[PDB]
Amino acid sequence: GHRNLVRKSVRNLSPAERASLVAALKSLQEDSSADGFQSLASFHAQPPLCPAPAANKAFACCVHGMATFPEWHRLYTVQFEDALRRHGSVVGIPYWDTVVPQEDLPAFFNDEIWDDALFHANFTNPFNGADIDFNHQKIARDINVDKLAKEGPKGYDTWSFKQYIYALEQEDYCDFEVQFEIAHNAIHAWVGGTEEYSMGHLHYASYDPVFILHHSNTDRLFALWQELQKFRGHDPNEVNCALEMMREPLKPFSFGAPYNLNPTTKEHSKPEDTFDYKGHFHYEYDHLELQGMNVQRLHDYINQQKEADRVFAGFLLEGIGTSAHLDFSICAIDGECTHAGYFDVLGGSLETPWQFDRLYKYEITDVLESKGLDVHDVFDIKITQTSWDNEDISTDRFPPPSVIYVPK
Amino acid sequence: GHRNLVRKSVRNLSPAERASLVAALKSLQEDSSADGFQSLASFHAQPPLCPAPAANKAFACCVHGMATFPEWHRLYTVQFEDALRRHGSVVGIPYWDTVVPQEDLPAFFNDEIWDDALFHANFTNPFNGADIDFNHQKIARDINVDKLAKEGPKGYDTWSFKQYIYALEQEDYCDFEVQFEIAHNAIHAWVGGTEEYSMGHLHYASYDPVFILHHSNTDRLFALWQELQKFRGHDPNEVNCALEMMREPLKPFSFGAPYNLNPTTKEHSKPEDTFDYKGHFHYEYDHLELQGMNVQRLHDYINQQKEADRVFAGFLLEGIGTSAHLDFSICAIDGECTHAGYFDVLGGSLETPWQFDRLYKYEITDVLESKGLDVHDVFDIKITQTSWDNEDISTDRFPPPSVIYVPK
Amino acid sequence: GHRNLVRKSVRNLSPAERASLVAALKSLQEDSSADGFQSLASFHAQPPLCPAPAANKAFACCVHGMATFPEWHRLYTVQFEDALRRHGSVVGIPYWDTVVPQEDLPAFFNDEIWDDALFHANFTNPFNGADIDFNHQKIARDINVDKLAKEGPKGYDTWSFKQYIYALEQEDYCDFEVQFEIAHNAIHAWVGGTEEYSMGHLHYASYDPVFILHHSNTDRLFALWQELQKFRGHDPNEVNCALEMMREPLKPFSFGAPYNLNPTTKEHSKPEDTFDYKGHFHYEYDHLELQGMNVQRLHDYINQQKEADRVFAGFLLEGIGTSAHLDFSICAIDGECTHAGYFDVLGGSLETPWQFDRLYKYEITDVLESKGLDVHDVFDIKITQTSWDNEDISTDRFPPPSVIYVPK
Amino acid sequence: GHRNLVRKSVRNLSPAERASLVAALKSLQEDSSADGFQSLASFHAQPPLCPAPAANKAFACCVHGMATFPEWHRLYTVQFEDALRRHGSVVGIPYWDTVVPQEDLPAFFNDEIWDDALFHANFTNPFNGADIDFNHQKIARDINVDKLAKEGPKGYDTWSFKQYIYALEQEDYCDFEVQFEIAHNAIHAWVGGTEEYSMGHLHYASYDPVFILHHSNTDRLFALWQELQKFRGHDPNEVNCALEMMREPLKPFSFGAPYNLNPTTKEHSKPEDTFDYKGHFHYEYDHLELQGMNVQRLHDYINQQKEADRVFAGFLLEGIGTSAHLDFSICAIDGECTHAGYFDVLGGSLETPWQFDRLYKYEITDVLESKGLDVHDVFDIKITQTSWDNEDISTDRFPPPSVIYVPK
Ligand SMILES: CC(=O)N[C@@H]1[C@@H](O)[C@H](O)[C@@H](CO)O[C@H]1O
Ligand SMILES: CC(=O)N[C@@H]1[C@@H](O)[C@H](O)[C@@H](CO)O[C@H]1O
Ligand SMILES: CC(=O)N[C@@H]1[C@@H](O)[C@H](O)[C@@H](CO)O[C@H]1O
């Protein structure tokens, strides 16, 4: 990078860059050290250790369902970087930008073997699996849905684009968050699938190697939002919202030794001061941009989205239990529904209670125009949460959604 | 007039006017028909009449914590106003402005003896109380806060003013309601105080005649907003918010006979169609202002409110149980606090569940500062919610209040 | 043992008569013996002593949800009757008919105390409640809908009438026990309202005496149907239906000593062997007429109904595990629903799962008509399930009601 | 588009005719388009594309176990027929009638190869199997019971005859689809015997063409019933039954583009709108007679049956998740059982759970008679369930069969 470690597409890496990361985590993996892989995992969920790392009832950590979410996870990736160079990660933990239709799957983390046979090495792509220690099983993803190589009625017109872009449109940090965070979940799910020990499970994603690679990109999106904020005229590290959490540290990052042998994360635990990453954490992205759209190109695209009447459904997420996913559709008066959109929440047991202080908006303008329906009409919205396993979830007490309207 | 009634303050009510009114409800109070007083009372709460009078588990029947709240309560006064009409009234249901500091509690409804001219009579003040029949009980009032009688750092800048005015600084209807309603909640308590049977108890609170009086000033100022919105450029009769509910016919009004003999309110159960009062209900307010400044002077006021940094506490109101009061204090790092502010909610144990889909912000600016406190100063915030009875209710699971900051 | 008995209405009871029964159960209720009250109480459901009385997992021995229900409960009133006799009774167990709107609560079972009145002295009305020793608890009551009195959109046609009359229409023993049972569910509800230890709970209900009182009026209908059929041309005592189970001994009446010291009760445990009560069980009814109408008049009243197009909703009952109650409305394409009817089951932790082999029908012609609708027009139809202890039951997994059309 | 079609028997087919269809499907089977074979194949069950085609948990879109089954499969033969036409076909999809003992296997679908024979040349018989691309597998067959040929304790009365004849007796649309479906189950079994990828599996079966062939002979009976009824006095196109679902659009035929490029198919997705095939779907049958017997002769043959006491067993089907087959005998009190009958369902991992709202009946008079037994005598009745892949299915939890008696 500048010195700043540069985080890049796990895709356009160097045979060398790659190699380094391979040996790196390979080592990292059997680093029984407090700041060794396997204990880092114990941060995000199981074994939990948050109220304290051993007090009464152990809630797991990882600010999920709250504002101070990205800050937490931001420390975590770095907590993994300032962890790879411990093993000579010649570079910064690369990102797997799911935001774009990926036909073939990135080989960096799909291969189960790796012939360093040119050099002296020939085995498993450590960046393709790990072993859950205490819970003695194997993270084994079930991508199941490789329709993460899907839609785009216009090509780039895909889920994540719609998701992030909107997220990005938000100017109030907190508005941006709920949305930003829901896209996070997508990939948690799109990979863990219907399996237990995997990326689709609060308690276990940490264990899988791709975790880093994804949050690396989510935190790359986060960055992308700061940068756009700056371009809009706002201080990108200014959070005037939720100023009750930002000051409160961030466990265990704040725990110090001997659970976190890092000092920067430690010193930088109060989210408040974790926004401007480049300073406190020297690392950066090669291209703060979304799907080859310049920061000015993004802004600009957004304001063109604003050029017309739009229609959204609001979601009051209170989420609890295991992570689940939900579909919703626009039923017409005699009952003519159309799949309108979907989203998923990550979660488990030890999750720490959470309820968004606000709605999760989700555009439906299109599905509506298609079906010849306007905001002046009678149409009802219908949902069905569903567990990470064929278990229909009662959509009863679950507050019905609003149906916002954003003119101009 | 032909196709309108006019609403004045109880305090500008010429004996002429109030005479009509005294004999009106008096007659009303004796109307045993489905659109006579007693009847026209449960429409609110007890006895339950809402899923359907015939249903098994029955809830209240009035929209609370919900964007359609004002329209319902607005539709309700029309219901009363129309009965008085049917009973020799010649004026609209007067509003008891509680905005301005009350020197004493108005005559119209305070004394309990209507003597006066023409008939040379001498009998009870119908507008001073009725009595709950089904319950064999009788209405009550307990103004344990009459110190509601003028507080105000700089004079006319009083609580409910502070309150109702913020609310007006808001063009996102839902945003304004979640504030416009908490305001309204105050009198509900300022009057019933602690009487299990009174303006302070979701259930019987519709039987005391102030209900109407009060709910007329609210309806008043709500009309105000509309007006104000006009002066801001927006369509004062369009709500591009919560449309999923702005369309569900408001019961009982949507019941028609034999529960609701009034036609122009079935014809209007849809909130959607309750915004245009003068026109669908033909009833006007004498004036449209709030404590002095006109619609304009209003707009030309709030702005000033926006010329300085402000600091709010947001409250995530899931509300449920019985009516109850919450007060909150800012606590300095050390251990001492200062009374922050306080709001209250009205709520029977016969209410349909309800949780707001947005935070309920309230200003702690000054207080904070008058405590040598900066928006960026390490400080906590403890809350207290006690019933109307006096059981301290454990907030152990009440979501901690945020601490929003505000630019400009 | 020797002598017939004539069961009378719980109103045309002569103080001599009443006296014999008052003193009888009084004695019964102190009969510690296996054929004593607290014990005969057990036969229905709790303490369960079912497949056997000693095996690991046990259930409430009573038949519910199955074809063979009316026999089980028939043997049971006999079991109790013979027992009342054994203690001095000399009249059959009276029946509290409720197809007729009760304007008050029959003395027999309501007085808190009774007066020998044939020697004058005070004792508590044994037919007014009882203890429940194993549970160390006491029955209780709650006449919930004493609004049962409240009935008759056109006179005597009360819910139960419509309800039983229909059951009497069906000429197939099976198609009819569907209705006849679901009818025998109402009093259960209307006497135990929300109280856990009462009639509304499979477990304790047979602990309260009004059960005997009820199930005597049901068996009164069962005999009556037996007339309507004989009058119709059929041999009462045989059924062209369900023969798979009409011969499986009923428990525990079959056990014999030591859980059933009664021999007629046992020897006649096979339901087929109990259709001709008087012959097997010496006992008859003062009268067999619903609303005082002849078996002939019934056969007339029915066909007369067989004269218009009707319309019914279809219910596939299965039974939760707790007594519940659902009422279904019948919303228009508009979104304006309209209460149309209801029924309730009698569930219980300790039951043996059951589902009726056919649908339970329930006419909606009328409600339809009074809404400008008919079988060809478009209408939807909604349900809402509630537990006895106010607790909405998820109806998500509840096969939707079908809507029939019956010509003639 | 324009022109009627007459569906013929798969035997009285003229080489010209056959030719048009042979070349047609041949073409069809190479139609990669949404309305191509491999795709139209999907409509039934696998690949599932059901509630919607993109939501998380998906099911086989086909209706089974429900009232609305005969329409679904009716729209489906049309969906395929129009498609055969689109490729050159000019005759309706023939029907392989099997109510009549097939002594051989009809050429149409059996020759491994065919000879243009109207220009002479070899091509493979497209109506003889197909590939199944998604599964990367190929249909297969196993005529298991080519012992189907084997039938007739007294001639033409083959299992299917007894079976269908009965379905035609019932005059209630619903009571009859119970039989009519369970009948449409036999060929499924008798063609796919033990082979996983064949007709005996909900998933793949519509992949083999003889399905079309079958479901054309079923729809042939469905029309026939429609005669017997019209002849009986009823309006074919309406049903006095199940109206709750006769108007719920069938999937995916309703979807439209891009999963159903057919418009008649969609526009007529509501089952009510499909009873009068010829009118909606241009197409008829050469004949409508079971065993060559007139609609009149049927109405005669039936009543004639309505002339003796019969006896039936009762089955409450629910459906496992896999196609199964059970056969019930009817053991004496002796311990000497006697095969009495059987039937089989068509299950599948991917189904939408269903249970019939009523029992499925199946007569045992005869077997009873030939054993010196009748409805009053004592006899028990046993079942044995086996999977297609030899695997005894636990019948422990399977509501026992009831045994009816039908006089007249
Ligand atoms: C995976 C691979 O490249 N194949 C090699 C194989 O050619 C070789 O015979 C062997 C020596 O034991 O190691 C294998 O498994
Ligand atoms: C059996 C074993 O150790 N696995 C080897 C692996 O090391 C090597 O990378 C691969 C290609 O040479 O050949 C496999 O057979
Ligand atoms: C003369 C009279 O009765 N009318 C009074 C008036 O003097 C007073 O100014 C007004 C409030 O400003 O209230 C009216 O009722």
Ligand SMILES: [Cu+2]
């Ligand atoms: Cu996380």
Ligand SMILES: [Cu+2]
């Ligand atoms: Cu209210």
Ligand SMILES: [Cu+2]
């Ligand atoms: Cu109110």
Ligand SMILES: [Cu+2]
């Ligand atoms: Cu019972």
Ligand SMILES: [Cu+2]
């Ligand atoms: Cu005496």
Ligand SMILES: [Cu+2]
């Ligand atoms: Cu099928």
Ligand SMILES: [Cu+2]
């Ligand atoms: Cu030739």
